[PDB]
Design a protein around this nucleic acid. Sequence first.
DNA 1: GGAGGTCGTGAGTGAT
DNA 2: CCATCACTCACGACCT
Lengths: 314, 287
Amino acid sequence: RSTKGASKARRDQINAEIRNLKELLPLAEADKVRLSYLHIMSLACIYTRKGVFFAGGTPLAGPTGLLSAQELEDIVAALPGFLLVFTAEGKLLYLSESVSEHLGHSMVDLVAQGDSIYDIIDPADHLTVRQQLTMLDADRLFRCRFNTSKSLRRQSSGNKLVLIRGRFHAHPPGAYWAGNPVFTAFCAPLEPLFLAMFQSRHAKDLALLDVSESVLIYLGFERSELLCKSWYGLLHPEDLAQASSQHYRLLAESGDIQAEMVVRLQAKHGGWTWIYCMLYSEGPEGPITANNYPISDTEAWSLRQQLNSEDTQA
Amino acid sequence: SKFSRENHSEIERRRRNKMTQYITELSDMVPTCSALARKPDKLTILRMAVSHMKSMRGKPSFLTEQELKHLILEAADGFLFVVAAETGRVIYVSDSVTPVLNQPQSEWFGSTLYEQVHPDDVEKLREQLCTSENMGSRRSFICRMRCGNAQYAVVHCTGYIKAWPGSKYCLVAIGRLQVTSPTEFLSRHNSDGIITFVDPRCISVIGYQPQDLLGKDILEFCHPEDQSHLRESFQQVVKLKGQVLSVMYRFRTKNREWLLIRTSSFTFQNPYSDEIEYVTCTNTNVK
DNA sequence: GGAGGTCGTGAGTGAT
DNA sequence: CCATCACTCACGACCT
């Protein structure tokens, strides 16, 4: 007979429950008004997954009543990255506010188009990311480009590089948590306290013209004992070819080339330290500047799988 | 033209599909609902959703101050402890001390952090716990903490001093593990034959420790009749600019026996200077 | 009859 | 204030 006025109540009922969700969503009402119904039904899923994952676990929360006024909500601002939590299939569970500093886009802004990690990162990395999320070893570190802001695309040369260091956690008893673990990660940008770095300056034959003084912590050598030593004299003979070919690439008929490599360096007392090494040229045939990132063998293996797949797809 | 209307059709289509897929992801990940096979009325789906979104609490942020805690403690792998500033007595520790340090959580409770650290680092640990009003309330220190199962692991701790809300002050901190990780062995030599590096696999093949061989000529461990042959092979390797040469000779073990060793060697040259950084030698026990 | 979900189309809007 | 492709609402016939 008459489907209008009858089928209307259905729509204005589901679009009233959506609205009773958005007035509950933990956001600020400066942006809680420009939120499409599609956002609410694509952004409240993340909150609901947070709720069901956390409320359904043993109270393994480290402390109880110590950081209990705002210090936990203040250290997050001072950390050199942003927290990111998701499922192995790519669906997010939490993204701290802090992302606004690092990608230039709000949490209310990135995930408003979609549900999953693959709506924020660059579609050129989707394969690589997927690889690392399918490969028991509770550790995973991989390097990835995230979509940036239009306010920082005007000032940075594209989408940001981000190191992603995390581990797959013990999933709670559930239906979707079954067979789908939860990956918690610290994600810091690499294109300029937990982010271990000693930095170095090399000449055109990778000799240590200078090094940061935090090297003593991760190698046992004072800066005094390392100056003018040959970097190939700190390497492990297995990683010889990798560093040599990256050094060739770094020495071309131009400058301004990034060179990625995961290597081992020999410490003072002789233990081998895993170093993710980002070499860039601060000038064509000028200086060599290297960011060094100490990592664990699991993280080194993950990042090597990354770079192997990348050089494969060149 | 003719498609400024039907493109709109598939646009609204993709919108409806987005919300169907989302309302299904709500129809898989809510407890009051995941306990069926009949995916109920979509309105009732959203209603069980609002039920589970009236569950817990939280100008604003996203999650409460025990979620962010678990998260920062899992991203920054390690444990969180809370010690009294003056007495050093352990008021509190998280269970994560067990997978990090292998000590049971009952052995940390009550004891002093001075017992759990290395004696040389005890004065340094006191220096950082002393409350003399030195931004300036955050502490950061590297010490050696006792491992369970002599046995010590380097721990980098970061925390801050707070009045507990003679234990008028206490340090609340997080401790991260500063991990940083047969028949043949590798060795590196300079142009002259002086050993610059040895793989610690030498202990097993020839019985010597690495520092027992660092800085000596490789010929002081060769057998007198074979010195000339090895010296000529080294001299040729230097000229072979990366080619792999192979020589056989009798090597003097640490128990003063003579082991037959097959050494494969090649120079490594630096891609810009072409100078011999070292001669890489893979030494294989053959007989 | 009575839910309950879809679809192509009409319109209100925040935007360069 | 006025087109413009693009969002993002609502609508009423019309299947399962």
